Design a protein around this ligand. Sequence first.
Ligand SMILES: [Mg+2]
Ligand SMILES: [Mg+2]
Ligand SMILES: [Mg+2]
Ligand SMILES: [Mg+2]
Ligand SMILES: [Mg+2]
Ligand SMILES: [Mg+2]
Ligand SMILES: [Mg+2]
Ligand SMILES: [Mg+2]
Ligand SMILES: [Mg+2]
Ligand SMILES: [Mg+2]
Ligand SMILES: [Mg+2]
Ligand SMILES: [Mg+2]
Ligand SMILES: [Mg+2]
Ligand SMILES: [Mg+2]
Ligand SMILES: [Mg+2]
Ligand SMILES: [Mg+2]
Ligand SMILES: [Mg+2]
Ligand SMILES: [Mg+2]
Ligand SMILES: [Mg+2]
Ligand SMILES: [Mg+2]
Ligand SMILES: [Mg+2]
Ligand SMILES: [Mg+2]
Ligand SMILES: [Mg+2]
Ligand SMILES: [Mg+2]
Ligand SMILES: [Mg+2]
Ligand SMILES: [Mg+2]
Ligand SMILES: [Mg+2]
Ligand SMILES: [Mg+2]
Ligand SMILES: [Mg+2]
Ligand SMILES: [Mg+2]
Ligand SMILES: [Mg+2]
Ligand SMILES: [Mg+2]
Ligand SMILES: [Mg+2]
Ligand SMILES: [Mg+2]
Ligand SMILES: [Mg+2]
Ligand SMILES: [Mg+2]
Ligand SMILES: [Mg+2]
Ligand SMILES: [Mg+2]
Ligand SMILES: [Mg+2]
Ligand SMILES: [Mg+2]
Ligand SMILES: [Mg+2]
Ligand SMILES: [Mg+2]
Ligand SMILES: [Mg+2]
Ligand SMILES: [Mg+2]
Ligand SMILES: [Mg+2]
Ligand SMILES: [Mg+2]
Ligand SMILES: [Mg+2]
Ligand SMILES: [Mg+2]
Ligand SMILES: [Mg+2]
Ligand SMILES: [Mg+2]
Ligand SMILES: [Mg+2]
Ligand SMILES: [Mg+2]
Ligand SMILES: [Mg+2]
Ligand SMILES: [Mg+2]
Ligand SMILES: [Mg+2]
Ligand SMILES: [Mg+2]
Ligand SMILES: [Mg+2]
Ligand SMILES: [Mg+2]
Ligand SMILES: [Mg+2]
Ligand SMILES: [Mg+2]
Ligand SMILES: [Mg+2]
Ligand SMILES: [Mg+2]
Ligand SMILES: [Mg+2]
Ligand SMILES: [Mg+2]
Ligand SMILES: [Mg+2]
Ligand SMILES: [Mg+2]
Ligand SMILES: [Mg+2]
Ligand SMILES: [Mg+2]
Ligand SMILES: [Mg+2]
Ligand SMILES: [Mg+2]
Ligand SMILES: [Mg+2]
Ligand SMILES: [Mg+2]
Ligand SMILES: [Mg+2]
Ligand SMILES: [Mg+2]
Ligand SMILES: [Mg+2]
Ligand SMILES: [Mg+2]
Ligand SMILES: [Mg+2]
Ligand SMILES: [Mg+2]
Ligand SMILES: [Mg+2]
Ligand SMILES: [Mg+2]
Ligand SMILES: [Mg+2]
Ligand SMILES: [Mg+2]
Ligand SMILES: [Mg+2]
Ligand SMILES: [Mg+2]
Ligand SMILES: [Mg+2]
Ligand SMILES: [Mg+2]
Ligand SMILES: [Mg+2]
Ligand SMILES: [Mg+2]
Ligand SMILES: [Mg+2]
Ligand SMILES: [Mg+2]
Ligand SMILES: [Mg+2]
Ligand SMILES: [Mg+2]
Ligand SMILES: [Mg+2]
Ligand SMILES: [Mg+2]
Ligand SMILES: [Mg+2]
Ligand SMILES: [Mg+2]
Lengths: 205, 97, 147
Amino acid sequence: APSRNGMVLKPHFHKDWQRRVATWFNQPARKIRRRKARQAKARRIAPRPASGPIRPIVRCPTVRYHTKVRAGRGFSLEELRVAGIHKKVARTIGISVDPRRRNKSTESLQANVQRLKEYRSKLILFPRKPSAPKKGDSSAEELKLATQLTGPVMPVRNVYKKEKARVITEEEKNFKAFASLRMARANARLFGIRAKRAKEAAEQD
Amino acid sequence: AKSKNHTTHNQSRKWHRNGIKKPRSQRYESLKGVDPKFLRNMRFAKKHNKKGLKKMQANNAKAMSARARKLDRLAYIAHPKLGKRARARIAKGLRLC
Amino acid sequence: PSRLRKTRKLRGHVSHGHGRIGKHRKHPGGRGNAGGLHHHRINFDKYHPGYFGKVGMKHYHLKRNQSFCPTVNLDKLWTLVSEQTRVNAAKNKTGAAPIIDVVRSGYYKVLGKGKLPKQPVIVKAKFFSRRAEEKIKSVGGACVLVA
RNA sequence: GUUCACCCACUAAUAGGGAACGUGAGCUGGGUUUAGACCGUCGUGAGACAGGUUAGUUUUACCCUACUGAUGAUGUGUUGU
RNA sequence: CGAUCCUUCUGACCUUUUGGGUUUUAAGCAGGAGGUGUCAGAAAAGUUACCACAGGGAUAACUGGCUUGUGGCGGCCAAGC
RNA sequence: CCAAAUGCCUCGUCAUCUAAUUAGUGACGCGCAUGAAUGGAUGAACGAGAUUCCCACUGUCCCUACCUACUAUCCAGCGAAACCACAGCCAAGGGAACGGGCUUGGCGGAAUCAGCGGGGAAAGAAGACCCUGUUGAGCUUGACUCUAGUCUGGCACGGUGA
RNA sequence: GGACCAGGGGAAUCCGACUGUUUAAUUAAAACAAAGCAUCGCGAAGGCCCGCGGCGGGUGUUGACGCGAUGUGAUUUCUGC
RNA sequence: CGAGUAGGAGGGCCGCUGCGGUGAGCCUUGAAGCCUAGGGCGCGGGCCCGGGUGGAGCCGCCGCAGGUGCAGAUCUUGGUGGUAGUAGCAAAUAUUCAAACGAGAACUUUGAAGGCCGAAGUGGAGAAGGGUUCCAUGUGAACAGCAGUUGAACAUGGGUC
RNA sequence: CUCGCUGGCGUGGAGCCGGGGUGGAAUGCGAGUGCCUAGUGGGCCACUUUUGGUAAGCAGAACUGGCGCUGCGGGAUGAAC
RNA sequence: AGACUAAUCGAACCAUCUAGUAGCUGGUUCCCUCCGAAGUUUCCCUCAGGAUAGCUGGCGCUCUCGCCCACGCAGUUUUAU
RNA sequence: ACCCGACCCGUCUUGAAACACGGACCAAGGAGUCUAACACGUGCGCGAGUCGGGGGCUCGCACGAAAGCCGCCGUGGCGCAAUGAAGGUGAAGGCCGGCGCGCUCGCCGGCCGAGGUGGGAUCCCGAGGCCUCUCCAGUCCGCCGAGGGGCACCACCGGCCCGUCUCGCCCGCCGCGCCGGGGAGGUGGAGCACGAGCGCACGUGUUAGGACCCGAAAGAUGGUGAACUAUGCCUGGGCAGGG
RNA sequence: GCUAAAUACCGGCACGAGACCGAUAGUCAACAAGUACCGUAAGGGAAAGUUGAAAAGAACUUUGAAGAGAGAGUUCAAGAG
Ligand SMILES: [Mg+2]
Ligand SMILES: [Mg+2]
Ligand SMILES: [Mg+2]
Ligand SMILES: [Mg+2]
Ligand SMILES: [Mg+2]
Ligand SMILES: [Mg+2]
Ligand SMILES: [Mg+2]
Ligand SMILES: [Mg+2]
Ligand SMILES: [Mg+2]
Ligand SMILES: [Mg+2]
Ligand SMILES: [Mg+2]
Ligand SMILES: [Mg+2]
Ligand SMILES: [Mg+2]
Ligand SMILES: [Mg+2]
Ligand SMILES: [Mg+2]
Ligand SMILES: [Mg+2]
Ligand SMILES: [Mg+2]
Ligand SMILES: [Mg+2]
Ligand SMILES: [Mg+2]
Ligand SMILES: [Mg+2]
Ligand SMILES: [Mg+2]
Ligand SMILES: [Mg+2]
Ligand SMILES: [Mg+2]
Ligand SMILES: [Mg+2]
Ligand SMILES: [Mg+2]
Ligand SMILES: [Mg+2]
Ligand SMILES: [Mg+2]
Ligand SMILES: [Mg+2]
Ligand SMILES: [Mg+2]
Ligand SMILES: [Mg+2]
Ligand SMILES: [Mg+2]
Ligand SMILES: [Mg+2]
Ligand SMILES: [Mg+2]
Ligand SMILES: [Mg+2]
Ligand SMILES: [Mg+2]
Ligand SMILES: [Mg+2]
Ligand SMILES: [Mg+2]
Ligand SMILES: [Mg+2]
Ligand SMILES: [Mg+2]
Ligand SMILES: [Mg+2]
Ligand SMILES: [Mg+2]
Ligand SMILES: [Mg+2]
Ligand SMILES: [Mg+2]
Ligand SMILES: [Mg+2]
Ligand SMILES: [Mg+2]
Ligand SMILES: [Mg+2]
Ligand SMILES: [Mg+2]
Ligand SMILES: [Mg+2]
Ligand SMILES: [Mg+2]
Ligand SMILES: [Mg+2]
Ligand SMILES: [Mg+2]
Ligand SMILES: [Mg+2]
Ligand SMILES: [Mg+2]
Ligand SMILES: [Mg+2]
Ligand SMILES: [Mg+2]
Ligand SMILES: [Mg+2]
Ligand SMILES: [Mg+2]
Ligand SMILES: [Mg+2]
Ligand SMILES: [Mg+2]
Ligand SMILES: [Mg+2]
Ligand SMILES: [Mg+2]
Ligand SMILES: [Mg+2]
Ligand SMILES: [Mg+2]
Ligand SMILES: [Mg+2]
Ligand SMILES: [Mg+2]
Ligand SMILES: [Mg+2]
Ligand SMILES: [Mg+2]
Ligand SMILES: [Mg+2]
Ligand SMILES: [Mg+2]
Ligand SMILES: [Mg+2]
Ligand SMILES: [Mg+2]
Ligand SMILES: [Mg+2]
Ligand SMILES: [Mg+2]
Ligand SMILES: [Mg+2]
Ligand SMILES: [Mg+2]
Ligand SMILES: [Mg+2]
Ligand SMILES: [Mg+2]
Ligand SMILES: [Mg+2]
Ligand SMILES: [Mg+2]
Ligand SMILES: [Mg+2]
Ligand SMILES: [Mg+2]
Ligand SMILES: [Mg+2]
Ligand SMILES: [Mg+2]
Ligand SMILES: [Mg+2]
Ligand SMILES: [Mg+2]
Ligand SMILES: [Mg+2]
Ligand SMILES: [Mg+2]
Ligand SMILES: [Mg+2]
Ligand SMILES: [Mg+2]
Ligand SMILES: [Mg+2]
Ligand SMILES: [Mg+2]
Ligand SMILES: [Mg+2]
Ligand SMILES: [Mg+2]
Ligand SMILES: [Mg+2]
Ligand SMILES: [Mg+2]
Ligand SMILES: [Mg+2]
């Protein structure tokens, strides 16, 4: 079968694929199902925003993506506890709750507490009975719009650094190096044996 | 299943369709397959052409450069450029009585 | 377009462009990659050299995920910033320099070419290469690692 | 089964041949050469054996041609001798 | 005189053993072997007359044709009878 | 026990049957390759079994003839089908080597009936022989790879007492 | 026997004891069976077999004068190494 | 300068069918088809024109899209021939004369003669299976391999305690 | 001039730089170069040269042309003369 | 007897998987203009097939000839060897 | 009517009027398709970039199952960077000087910054003469010897990165170590030498898909048949005369 | 141990759309189609659309017994009976 110069092609068509093929001609219909599903979700609720649970702020776990940031799933129980509010109180406020999430980094941890202080500043709620506890006055006709768009706070807003200008100094262009990667990379590979070779040097005696 | 085995009948006629193309001419013959010790002399000889000589050789070029009659007759009548006085006598020529 | 074909030209002709004598049948030399080692070695070798055999160590659960470092060379190095800054780094000031960060644009390792801009710089990267690090020391610039 | 071959008798003589080794929609089906089977040799074996013996469906012409036989057929007006 | 895959052995005070280590085992890089004699490298017995299908006059047994050794028929020379 | 339903050479050789017998029968045995439950050899009765001979019989034949019954034949009536390139007079020629067409010649008249079977390499089936196929199926063993069962080993149920 | 109705006969050789059966649609045979003669397994928690399964089944409403497995094929005379 | 199998390209104002565009296109005052000793054009694929039939839709040009162009496959399905008024209507002995009804009689009905099945029947009754075939009347286009004034046919109506 | 090779020799030999003269047999022609790829992968005959054969309208080749793929005029007719 | 098992037997019938596979047979639908071959090499369980070259087509590209001597090329000679 | 020419078409084939095969005759049906993927070629858009292909926004307007928008939806795909089994490393030289024995020898300071040679379309400079008396003068057209900077590209040299091999030398110390780095050569690389892709469309081509149509002998799965026949089994029936 | 979402739907209940097919096409089925009819059965499984605007579907006259016709009529047309 093969011939003059061409690439080896191995397609996966020995398996009788024509019985099992999903065809996307139902693609405009579901798209109109789903706008009319979100808009049916829009006019049920009330003043509360669609996509209304607020999400936390989470850095992306790898070496590849950890220089960007992402709306996670739920505020940490210990994050949310620094704001001081109880668990199932908080979901009625409209905050997402996640028990699985730790907090190793207080720069991460306090950044979400600032976000909850933001949202609880942001919040205009309504009571059942106007006994005036954590409630709102006649407030900007339900604050000028009932519903928000794509999260309440624009969760990405990925923060950039300027560090605008500086003079270059002595002893940085004198000392820094390529080689202080290579010296340190080779330092890490030999920490085990350099510990042991000197340990059996003094164990010899 | 008996067959014919080998024949160069009609192979002379196929080869000379496009023709026996002779490579024969090109310049600066390729420099692979050379005796390596010879090449381990010559690459060094090239790299000191550049570095070793400016002032000796270029000025040395500067020194040596500072050291340095009837049928013959009508063609001249009927030439395209050399005959306009040939017409001095048929056009505005001297002939007259 | 079935109106631009070869089929629509070849009607009226008998064998439809596949030969009386050889008779295009079904699958003469097998299906697919049949007989690579046996009767198609003059095709597989001389067109796909090295298709058969093994070379290396196995690596289980290879993620494309601990080897992620998009490179850059010193041609494109000025192209991350608006070139407003390289004018205002050439504005006769002092050894003040833009701190170009390649980690922002996505580039981890800075490889090298020749011919970098004369004006002094500070590059903040995760990885450097020593030819490129010889180039930034040429212009009097600096070389800062980020971790 | 014979092609072949010898054999007794007659006779002028019992010459040799060819026509898809004439001739099977002319026949006969003896043997070769389907399935049954027995013997012998070979094979561990199923099976094999120009080795031997026996039992085993031989189709259709009304077409065209050829031939044989049967009427007729174009011209001398008609028809008869 | 002999490829891939496999095996076996040797070589660096070599690379990787998967969260970081220490060691055993294993995986690799390089060059020597253990084979494919159908020898550019399949892992391999037999019968079919109970047979079957795809086909071939590319390939036999019958005719016909070319050839005429062999068979058959004659001719020239003359040692002899 | 024999040229056998088994003997290649082989129509073995002799003897009997015949005017004449590759047949039959009897005999002879280094019997190509007989033979003992692979059953050897006999033998009455029996046979839609095989082979030969004699007597009687007769159209099997010499050597054909004749009559009858039904068809065929002709007419009244109702009436298919196989098949079929167009078609069909022969000799030689070359030709894919054995033509209805081509070439050179022989020649050649409407349309048909009843016979006949020389030709149409006639019709009837994509050759059952043979060969190729990297196509099969039934069978077989000391083919290769396996497996039902079965034979033993070990563990579990599986304890008490000397 | 006046039509109908109805055994040609002997002399023998080969094969098979005979009667029976069989290849529906190419064969009635000498082929198969057959009584006779042998040989072997097994005393039942067993022989031979079925079974996808259980100590389910058939032989077994049985018991060595029986079941199961084969060769040979009446009789007479024989059964070598 | 021109050959051409296998083959590859190019041009097609060649044809068919469907879609946007355009033709102030076309037509019950006759569209499609189809036929045509009618007039032509093109090398050709194919087209335009007249006449005749029919009676309701159709074609150009620029683009777009094909399940798009037949002599063949022991082609599939449909249809008709030559063979052809030919084979053929030949198993088991058989008809005859007259009469009636009837458009119409070698066969239907009656009557007489001549016959055969010959009691293991061409007879008298059932089990199985057939399911209205049984009976009566009525017609004669089918069907009954000729015919029919007949029937186990068609049509109507009855009957199985 | 260079050389790290050669070496009695400023020598061997390559390499590099600059300068100086186009005209070096006949003949005919416009050449050079890259991509993709169908078809093919059963051949045959003839002058001369040839191997196996007794010989072949046989089997195997070399050189060239042809039939194939190709009509037309001649060989009565024909694939190749 | 390899028989019979619903005109089916050396493994029934029916439907699906199944439009199974095939290097093997048969067919492959409009015109015109241009160009136009191969049966050979090597290897293949290769010998009725492919792979690869050769041969063919197409699409381009880079240039030169338009004006006492051109550039380049070759199934050819000539002159040397 | 007649002269001359004139074998029946497809098919395999070295060859067909073939004593080779299929073809009685007409009408309709009827056979290289579509999806994926790769490759070259070509049109178009953008250009070190490109791509909405998946989502969201538009009011829910017949055609709308369309179209338009996003850009803090460019995540990603493909490309810009390679090489190595892997740890990993990852592509600038040229010019004028200086320091050491200026050597098989490396370093120090400026100045442009992708080398060189042969070829090389086009372009530029062109001596030189060319057009009615003559001088005397600038535009001017065309020819132009020779010279010049030279594109695309090909042939060759040098260099650079990585993997490797031989050779020997010097240095740096996030801490003195079988630690990091450098040199000169020789070879392995799908690379570097001022990038050309990407997205759609069309062609031709190969491959897997029923895959140009039609074709087997079979293989398995799961089912219906003892109304014929093979044989048992229960229950019934039948057989004249004579030796 | 339980739990909506977005996801899937060639059966079923309604429904709109089609660069589709237009009776040998499309489902096998535009029609008294899973029906006529074959097989005991498992199962297999066809064909068959078209008067006209409206029935105005040809009263009556006339041969034959009637089928079948000649006159007549209805219709734009019986060249739609
Ligand atoms: Mg190919
Ligand atoms: Mg499959
Ligand atoms: Mg060959
Ligand atoms: Mg062709
Ligand atoms: Mg071939
Ligand atoms: Mg082919
Ligand atoms: Mg592969
Ligand atoms: Mg004969
Ligand atoms: Mg015989
Ligand atoms: Mg015989
Ligand atoms: Mg036999
Ligand atoms: Mg033996
Ligand atoms: Mg007989
Ligand atoms: Mg005739
Ligand atoms: Mg691990
Ligand atoms: Mg070999
Ligand atoms: Mg076998
Ligand atoms: Mg042949
Ligand atoms: Mg002789
Ligand atoms: Mg006799
Ligand atoms: Mg013996
Ligand atoms: Mg013996
Ligand atoms: Mg014994
Ligand atoms: Mg003749
Ligand atoms: Mg002849
Ligand atoms: Mg001949
Ligand atoms: Mg002859
Ligand atoms: Mg003939
Ligand atoms: Mg003639
Ligand atoms: Mg006759
Ligand atoms: Mg006859
Ligand atoms: Mg014949
Ligand atoms: Mg015949
Ligand atoms: Mg055949
Ligand atoms: Mg083979
Ligand atoms: Mg197979
Ligand atoms: Mg005896
Ligand atoms: Mg008997
Ligand atoms: Mg019989
Ligand atoms: Mg006995
Ligand atoms: Mg038991
Ligand atoms: Mg005794
Ligand atoms: Mg031409
Ligand atoms: Mg038109
Ligand atoms: Mg038209
Ligand atoms: Mg269509
Ligand atoms: Mg089609
Ligand atoms: Mg054709
Ligand atoms: Mg046909
Ligand atoms: Mg007929
Ligand atoms: Mg007759
Ligand atoms: Mg007759
Ligand atoms: Mg009367
Ligand atoms: Mg009457
Ligand atoms: Mg009687
Ligand atoms: Mg009776
Ligand atoms: Mg009655
Ligand atoms: Mg009546
Ligand atoms: Mg009748
Ligand atoms: Mg009735
Ligand atoms: Mg092609
Ligand atoms: Mg090829
Ligand atoms: Mg020859
Ligand atoms: Mg050919
Ligand atoms: Mg030619
Ligand atoms: Mg010729
Ligand atoms: Mg001629
Ligand atoms: Mg002659
Ligand atoms: Mg001829
Ligand atoms: Mg048998
Ligand atoms: Mg049967
Ligand atoms: Mg069988
Ligand atoms: Mg098919
Ligand atoms: Mg299917
Ligand atoms: Mg099939
Ligand atoms: Mg040509
Ligand atoms: Mg071959
Ligand atoms: Mg063939
Ligand atoms: Mg070409
Ligand atoms: Mg032909
Ligand atoms: Mg034949
Ligand atoms: Mg034929
Ligand atoms: Mg025929
Ligand atoms: Mg058609
Ligand atoms: Mg492209
Ligand atoms: Mg991105
Ligand atoms: Mg199999
Ligand atoms: Mg089966
Ligand atoms: Mg089964
Ligand atoms: Mg019964
Ligand atoms: Mg759980
Ligand atoms: Mg119709
Ligand atoms: Mg249908
Ligand atoms: Mg109507
Ligand atoms: Mg009347
Ligand atoms: Mg009308």
